[PDB]
Ligand binder design. Structure first.
Ligand SMILES: CCCCCCCCCCCCCCCCCC(=O)OC[C@H](COP(=O)([O-])OCC(O)COP(=O)([O-])OC[C@@H](COC(=O)CCCCCCCCCCCCCCCCC)OC(=O)CCCCCCCCCCCCCCCCC)OC(=O)CCCCCCCCCCCCCCCCC
Ligand SMILES: CCCCCCCCCCCCCCCCCC(=O)OC[C@H](COP(=O)([O-])OCC(O)COP(=O)([O-])OC[C@@H](COC(=O)CCCCCCCCCCCCCCCCC)OC(=O)CCCCCCCCCCCCCCCCC)OC(=O)CCCCCCCCCCCCCCCCC
Ligand SMILES: CCCCCCCCCCCCCCCCCC(=O)OC[C@H](COP(=O)([O-])OCC[N+](C)(C)C)OC(=O)CCCCCCCCCCCCCCCCC
Ligand SMILES: CCCCCCCCCCCCCCCCCC(=O)OC[C@H](COP(=O)([O-])OCC[N+](C)(C)C)OC(=O)CCCCCCCCCCCCCCCCC
Ligand SMILES: CCCCCCCCCCCCCCCCCCCC(=O)O[C@H](COC(=O)CCCCCCCCCCCCCC)COP(=O)(O)OCCN
Ligand SMILES: CCCCCCCCCCCCCCCCCCCC(=O)O[C@H](COC(=O)CCCCCCCCCCCCCC)COP(=O)(O)OCCN
Ligand code: HEC
Ligand code: HEM
Ligand code: HEM
Ligand code: HEM
Ligand SMILES: CCCCCCCCCCCCO[C@@H]1O[C@H](CO)[C@@H](O[C@H]2O[C@H](CO)[C@@H](O)[C@H](O)[C@H]2O)[C@H](O)[C@H]1O
Ligand code: FES
Lengths: 111, 244, 124, 61, 71, 85, 54, 383, 55, 55
């Protein structure tokens, strides 16, 4: 599941990623990525994808679960984000920003 | 984009109010309010309309006060500062079915029924879109469409899957004026009603525009006469040149 | 641009037999389509005059030529505002489209460009 | 083409009854109609437009 | 009973017969394709939305005025 | 570069006589029918190409582009769309 | 006709007074005329036409 | 001496609107100036009126606009007049700029009025953009989001600048309040620059459609141009009436009647029609920073027309090749407009790039080439 | 001729704030004019700023 | 130090009847209290949250 938390008026996508989702994200060779990053750089905890859910193209919000890399699909110009929230296809230049977030408890994070 | 992703564009129906000189059919507006009250108001709010707005459009002052007085609204606190309710007055707004968005979504399998006060201006198509949407649920979704859970297929809605089920069926409303309440009749009435809700000045606006068109046309004609009159010395000027 | 530039470039074209063979017929049609003759203008009447150089060249016109120019501009302005064209004797015939001003502006500019050159001279 | 006392031909445009009161009156009827509609239009414009400043319907309730 | 039902049926059999037949043939193909096994593990799953839109768009063009005339 | 009445900056004028008649002495709409028909036809004919050429070209361009775009997002155009992306 | 000119047009004070009085009359009558016309072309549609049922 | 000339204050009015000497042959395209003055007055009158009813707080802005539509007497009219006249202001401003380009109004001695004009055009864009945000509907918000995130492309400081303009980390209440204050102010600045470009023009006077001097044959601004200006005022008000009273939402986008929701993104974010050409130019460049520079350059490049037009003749009345080139330029500017509202899909992506190259190449290549060649043709062709 | 006198726009500034001929003996009470100009500027700057925060 | 003492008087005497509506807990921080002390004061109270998922 992916939650949407408003944080500074921007939406925050929080996905509780499954084991196989993590695996899917850890596949793509870093080399072939507009914005080259691995999931370990993105998340500080593999079960908590926390991203700022604004598309890096113009600044629409991607609809999650949709896409072609089954992560997030920006409907505005058709840019596809990953399960890491990395850009794969479409106009968007960068991967979906990661806020500065810390796990205060194991059950609560501050953003 | 795929046509699916856009939605089918609604037909252009000949609404009574289409036409530079045409008002709404107020009998239709009244019938449409009854459809809103008995069908849509279960899920959709009409937050921008006050009871006073129906007066002299669809209802007499007495009928509208009766509608308001059936409801309870939040009063100012009593003398011990405890909260109180009062009966509604004409200045009150028509109250919504849900206290907040979260309650609304919980009742509608996640989907949030929008407020209908502006929906006729807030969608490409206007009345035609509302009419097309309410009447456009096929018995069976086109073969090969995979609907998301809690979605219903409707081609006019962009993407095809709408969280609102078909709601108008023959005889869900019993009109007080003896008009046969067919699906299409109820959709026509409610779509007229919602169009009025979105633009309640529509009748007055088009009458003043008729006056404006006439006066401004006359002033345009006269301004051309006056311009030609004042300019005729310059247009009619002739020269004789004798090189010195 | 400077009239000097226009004149020099045109002379390069008229010299080359090849170039003149292809350009002179084009330029004749261009001027027919341009349609300034239908308002009774000579080509030179159209040159931009709100420049110090051109103001000086106009002051150097012989009085007769100057009075005639004023009439052509006033006549054309009247046809313009009436949305009429010249008819009969008012239409500029190709033989009457003489470069009355080009000599004067070429002299004004010659001096102005010499002045610029000489302002940049270096004693060797 | 040479004599300046030979006034150019204006017969296409000259009104025969040009110095009659009828003639002037007509043109002032056009100007006055235009002033009348402008006055009526300005009154309508001002009255309608400034009425925005009068108590709105929510206030009147 | 609902005037639209009759008008839509009449317009499908009449002026929009070519589109009716297109949609029908499409549905036949897709149902048959879904019937076959290893359909769930196919790359491209064909729909009939396009044909449906062509039909509906046609029906609406031939019906809109007639329908509002009987309300 | 422009003066004012009395010293507008015209080269000296001489030899032009200008004549005109009063607006009250003129028919303001004299020969308006002839002008509305024959004069407008003349003036429009003379300028027609300068409007028709660019408009017809850009309309053709748009028509081709909008029709291709429409076709690419059909079922028939699936493959050509896949290549174009 | 000279009389008409002399009375209503010759003095601008009179002409402006005539224009404003005409504007007043036009404004009032045009209002009434449009009202009636609008009611005829939109007959049985407006609230005034259905109000009698209530 | 007459009072209108004697008294210093009256004399300034006199010099601009009454005794001002004008060419006697200005055609109807010289009337857009006064229509833009009328638009600016209608926008001040309706704008100040809406400000008396509008609340700039984000919790109440959209509701205040509904209050204007529904409760304020004639509020519907004042709102639609203000919204539509913003469209007509841009029709008139593009017409007025088109007139100026076709008739070479940008040439000496009128480079200064032209250059101030280009700034007026930028202020109008900013003014209209901020006004659009004030409704705080979905297009308002998503417009402000997109446009102010372009500033993020300014290197090093871009992000910081955006947050400073928003007054926050997103478009929200602080942004709305500050846009209200600025949108109120900017039209007054725009009026002052409009007045400066006229004062600048007063030295040379108006150009005319023949591109020759008019010093030979002048007409007082009143009554001749006064009465000519009334014809287009009434023509304008007829068009205004058709939109405002009969089709008030034809020029707009329904998405702005949905209240702003930072979560839900609307179907398609396209700007108001009059911004669409610049938006298409921006989309043409793939780089974010490149796109922004190109978009600004598409306006500022007008400032170089005085240099790149090499003609010895002012304006296009007599230049058949220049007229054809100008026709292509204007139609391309409209095609750019259309491409601003299509989806970023084939084949419009490549087409948008070609139209953008054509737009710039007019100023940089074609106009300098064509104007040089026509100089030579006039001279050889009249020998 | 100097630019400040030649150019129409500059000339207007020049005529008011630079070459404007003044009496040589104005005392300090002639300075309130410019203070009122300063007040008017401070009020515009602070006023427009408050308008960005006021509801 | 007086401000801190004064807050304690407000909290123990005046706050029984008088509100201090324009002051946020953050305002005490770095004036009278450390961030920790002020968060402790805030966390002792209950405030209205946004509705849960059933609204
Ligand atoms: C918007 C707000 C509403 C206010 C109305 C303002 C619009 C008025 C305006 O400037 O345009 C009218 C304007 C009339 O202006 P004008 O003073 O009669 O002549 C200006 C030109 O010199 C006229 O040029 P011309 O004398 O060479 O005649 C050209 C014109 C014929 O001009 C007309 O009289 C019409 O016909 C055309 O060019 C039509 C194009 C052919 C397509 C078929 O019409 C045009 O010029 C249209 C052509 C533009 C392309
Ligand atoms: C408030 C905003 C702050 C801005 C400050 C601006 C104030 C400056 C101003 O205009 O007044 C200074 C002004 C000095 O200006 P000033 O240009 O040297 O001479 C102006 C007088 O017309 C010259 O007057 P005078 O030459 O006849 O000198 C008269 C003055 C002596 O003036 C002196 O400064 C000493 O003494 C008195 O009138 C004092 C009266 C006896 C009090 C016991 O002070 C006065 O003279 C005050 C007299 C008012 C009663
Ligand atoms: C904006 C509101 C405009 C309302 C106009 C009010 C009536 C004045 C009018 O029509 O002007 C006619 C009058 C007269 O037009 P006139 O000046 O052509 O008539 C003068 C000659 N006699 C007196 C013989 C008719 O114009 C004015 O007085 C100027 C005022 C108009 C502003
Ligand atoms: C659509 C494309 C327009 C191309 C115009 C070509 C000339 C033409 O035929 O126009 C008729 C007329 C021709 O007028 P003219 O003054 O050249 O000729 C008058 C008659 N003669 C030749 C005898 C002197 O042109 C205009 O009036 C053009 C005005 C330009 C307005 C463009 C606005 C567009 C907005 C884009 C903003 C950037
Ligand atoms: C400021 C906004 C300017 C835009 C004006 C366009 C028309 C708006 C007028 C409002 C309107 O609907 O008036 C109608 C008549 O139109 C008309 O007759 C008005 C059109 C006439 C053109 C304008 C002429 C002058 C207007 C500007 C001057 C204002 C200030 C100067 C003192 C009908 O309304 P109604 O007839 O019911 O109204 C009551 C009087 N019976
Ligand atoms: C408010 C803040 C004021 C700060 C600005 C003061 C100028 C700083 C010092 C610079 C300086 O003294 O040099 C002169 C610049 O002053 C100038 O050119 C300006 C002179 C005075 C500054 C402002 C004038 C105020 C008059 C009206 C006040 C209006 C208040 C309304 C808002 C030029 O020296 P020089 O030019 O004499 O020659 C000398 C040879 N080049
Ligand atoms: C019991 C539920 C329910 C009833 C009854 C209902 N609606 Fe809805 N309606 C919804 C929900 C939920 C949505 C949101 C659908 C979505 O966004 O997927 C919706 C959406 C709409 C939309 C907007 C679709 C869009 O474009 O966003 C309109 C218009 C509409 N309803 C009108 C009506 C009218 C008119 C009636 C009855 C006369 C009606 N509804 C009855 C639940 C209902
Ligand atoms: C509020 C916006 C504007 C207003 C009210 C305005 C008004 C006017 C007026 C009244 C004139 C003289 C009459 C005329 O030629 O139409 C004029 C001339 C001119 N304007 Fe504008 N203008 C505006 C914007 C612009 C813009 C954006 C430009 C240029 C980009 C511009 C450039 C010019 C030029 C060059 C002239 C001189 C043209 C000539 O007469 O040959 N103006 N303007
Ligand atoms: C050049 C002048 C102006 C232009 C081009 C302009 C443009 C706009 C536009 C485009 C909108 C969006 C309209 C909508 O869709 O509802 C708007 C809204 C607004 N404008 Fe202006 N405006 C101008 C001047 C003014 C002025 C002087 C004020 C004075 C305060 C003002 C006050 C408002 C207000 C309050 C709104 C929001 C209410 C609304 O949306 O209708 N405007 N403006
Ligand atoms: C001559 C110029 C001005 C004068 C004399 C003036 C005067 C005042 C005064 C006396 C107040 C009451 C102050 C208070 O006790 O808080 C005030 C408030 C205000 N003024 Fe102005 N003002 C001026 C210009 C402006 C301008 C141009 C704006 C632009 C919007 C503006 C915006 C405000 C606002 C928003 C307030 C209310 C906030 C507040 O009270 O501080 N003012 N003004
Ligand atoms: C210096 C100028 C003088 C002061 C200006 C006066 C300002 C406002 C005065 C009148 C405003 C309210 O006055 C009122 O106007 C409105 C419309 O404008 C009229 O209202 C009438 O027409 C409107 C539409 O035109 C309808 O919506 C309304 O049902 C009808 O009664 C009222 O009949 C009149 O009583
Ligand atoms: S805005 Fe996200 S795809 Fe363009």
């Amino acid at each position: 599941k992916n939650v949407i938390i408003k944080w500074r008026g921007k939406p925050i996508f929080i996905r509780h990623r499954t084991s196989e989702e993590i695996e899917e994200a850890n596949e793509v060779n870093v080399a072939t990525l507009r914005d080259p990053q691995t999931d370990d750089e993105r998340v500080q905890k593999p079960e908590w994808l926390v991203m700022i859910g604004v598309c890096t193209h113009l600044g629409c919000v991607p609809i999650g679960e949709a896409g072609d890399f089954g992560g997030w699909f920006c409907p505005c110009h058709g840019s596809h984000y990953d399960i890491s929230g990395r850009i794969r296809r479409g106009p968007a230049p960068l991967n979906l920003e990661i806020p500065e977030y810390d796990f205060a408890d194991a059950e609560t994070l501050v953003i | 984009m795929t046509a699916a992703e856009h939605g089918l564009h609604p037909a252009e129906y000949p609404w009574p109010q289409n036409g530079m000189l045409s008002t709404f059919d107020h009998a239709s507006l009244r019938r449409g309010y009854q459809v809103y009250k008995e069908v849509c108001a279960a899920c959709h709010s009409l937050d921008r309309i006050a009871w006073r707005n129906l007066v002299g459009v669809t209802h007499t002052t007495d009928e509208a006060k009766a509608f308001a007085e059936e409801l309870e609204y939040d009063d100012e606190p009593d003398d011990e500062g405890n909260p109180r309710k009062r009966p509604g007055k004409l200045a009150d707004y028509i109250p919504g079915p849900y206290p907040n968005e979260q309650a609304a979504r919980a009742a509608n399998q996640g989907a949030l029924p929008p407020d209908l006060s502006l929906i006729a201006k807030a969608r490409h198509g206007g009345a035609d879109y509302i009419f097309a949407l309410l009447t456009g649920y096929p018995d069976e979704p086109p073969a090969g469409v995979v609907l998301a859970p809690g979605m219903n297929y409707n081609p006019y809605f962009p993407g095809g899957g709408i969280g609102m089920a078909r709601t108008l069926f023959d005889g869900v409303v019993e009109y007080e004026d003896g008009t046969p309440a067919t699906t299409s009749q109820m959709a026509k009435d409610v779509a007229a009603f919602l169009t009025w809700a979105a633009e309640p000045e529509h009748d007055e606006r088009k009458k003043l525009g008729l006056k404006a068109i006439i006066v401004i046309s006359a002033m345009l004609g006269l301004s051309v006469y006056i311009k030609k009159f004042k300019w005729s010395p310059i247009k009619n000027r002739k020269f004789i040149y004798n090189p010195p | 641009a400077s009239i000097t530039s226009v004149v020099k470039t045109s002379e390069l074209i008229l010299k080359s037999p090849l170039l003149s063979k292809i350009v002179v017929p084009l330029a004749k049609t261009y001027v027919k389509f341009s349609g300034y003759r239908q308002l009774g203008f000579k080509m030179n009447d159209l040159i931009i005059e709100e420049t110090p150089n051109m103001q000086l060249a106009l002051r150097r016109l012989p009085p007769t030529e100057s009075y005639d120019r004023v009439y052509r501009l006033i006549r054309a302005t009247q046809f313009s505002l009436s949305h009429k064209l010249a008819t009969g004797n008012d239409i500029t015939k190709p033989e009457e489209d003489d470069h009355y001003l080009i000599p004067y502006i070429l002299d004004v500019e010659a001096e102005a460009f010499e002045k610029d050159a000489l302002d940049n001279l270096e004693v060797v | 083409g040479k004599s300046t006392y030979k006034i150019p031909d204006f017969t296409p445009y000259l009104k025969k009854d040009r110095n009659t009161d009828a003639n002037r009156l007509f043109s002032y009827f056009m100007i006055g109609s235009f002033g009348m509609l402008s006055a009526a239009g300005a009154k309508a414009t001002v009255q309608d437009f400034l009425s925005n400043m009068s108590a709105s319907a929510d206030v009147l309730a | 009973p609902d005037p639209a039902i009759a008008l839509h049926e009449a317009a499908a059999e009449g002026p929009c017969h070519d589109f009716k037949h297109h949609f029908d043939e499409c549905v036949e193909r897709v149902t048959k394709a879904q019937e076959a096994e290893d359909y769930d593990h196919a790359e491209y799953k064909e729909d009939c939305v396009e044909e449906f839109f062509h039909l509906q768009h046609c029906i609406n063009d031939n019906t809109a005025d007639k329908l509002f005339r009987v309300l | 570069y422009m003066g004012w009445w009395g010293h507008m900056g015209s080269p000296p004028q001489k030899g032009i006589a200008g004549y005109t008649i009063s607006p009250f002495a003129a028919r303001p709409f004299a020969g308006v029918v002839h002008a509305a028909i024959f004069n407008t036809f003349r003036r429009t004919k003379n300028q027609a190409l300068f409007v028709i050429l660019p408009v017809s070209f850009f309309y053709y361009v748009w028509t081709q582009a909008s029709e291709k775009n429409e076709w690419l997002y059909t079922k028939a155009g699936r493959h050509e769309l896949a290549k174009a992306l | 006709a000279t009389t008409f000119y002399n009375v209503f047009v010759k003095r601008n004070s009179a002409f402006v007074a005539t224009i404003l009085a005409s504007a007043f009359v036009f404004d009032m009558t045009f209002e009434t005329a449009i009202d009636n016309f609008w009611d005829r072309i939109n007959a049985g549609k407006q609230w005034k036409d259905i109000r009698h049922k209530y | 001496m007459a009072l209108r000339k004697k008294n210093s204050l009256l004399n300034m009015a006199n010099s601009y609107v009454l005794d001002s000497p004008q060419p006697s042959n200005l055609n109807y395209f010289w009337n857009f100036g006064s229509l833009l003055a009328l638009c600016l007055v209608i926008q001040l009158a309706t704008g100040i009126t809406l400000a008396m009813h509008y609340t700039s707080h984000a919790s109440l802005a959209f509701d205040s606009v509904e209050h204007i539509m529904r409760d304020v007497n004639f509020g519907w009219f004042i709102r639609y007049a203000h919204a539509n006249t913003a469209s007509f202001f841009f029709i008139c401003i593009y017409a007025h700029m088109g007139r100026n380009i076709y008739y070479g109004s940008y040439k000496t001695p009128r480079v200064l009025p032209w250059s101030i004009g280009v700034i007026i055009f930028l202020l109008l864009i900013i003014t209209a953009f901020m006004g659009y945000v004030l409704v705080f509907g979905q297009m308002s918000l998503w417009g402000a989001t997109v446009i102010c995130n372009l500033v993020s492309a300014i290197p090093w400081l871009g992000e910081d600048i955006v947050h400073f303009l928003w007054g926050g980390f997103s478009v929200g209440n602080p942004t709305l309040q500050r846009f209200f204050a600025l949108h109120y102010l900017m039209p007054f600045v725009l009026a002052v620059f409009a007045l400066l470009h006229l004062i600048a023009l007063h030295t040379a006077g108006s150009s005319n459609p023949l591109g020759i001097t008019s010093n030979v044959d002048k007409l007082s601004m009143h009554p001749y141009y006064s009465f000519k200006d009334l014809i287009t005022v009434f023509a304008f008000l007829l068009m205004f009436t058709l939109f405002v009273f009969f089709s008030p939402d034809k020029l707009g986008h329904p998405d702005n009647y949905i209240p702003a929701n930072p979560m839900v993104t609307p179907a398609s974010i396209v700007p108001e029609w009059y911004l669409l050409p610049f938006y298409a130019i921006l989309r043409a460049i793939p780089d974010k920073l490149g796109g922004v520079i190109a978009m600004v350059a598409a306006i500022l490049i007008l400032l170089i027309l005085p240099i790149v037009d090499r003609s010895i003749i002012r304006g296009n009345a007599f230049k058949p090749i220049s007229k054809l080139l100008f026709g292509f330029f204007i139609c391309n500017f409209l095609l750019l407009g259309v491409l601003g509202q299509v989806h970023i899909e084939p084949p419009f992506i490549v087409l948008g790039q070609i139209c953008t190259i054509f737009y710039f190449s007019y100023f940089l290549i074609l106009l300098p080439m064509v104007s040089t060649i026509e100089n030579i043709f006039f001279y050889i062709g009249s020998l």
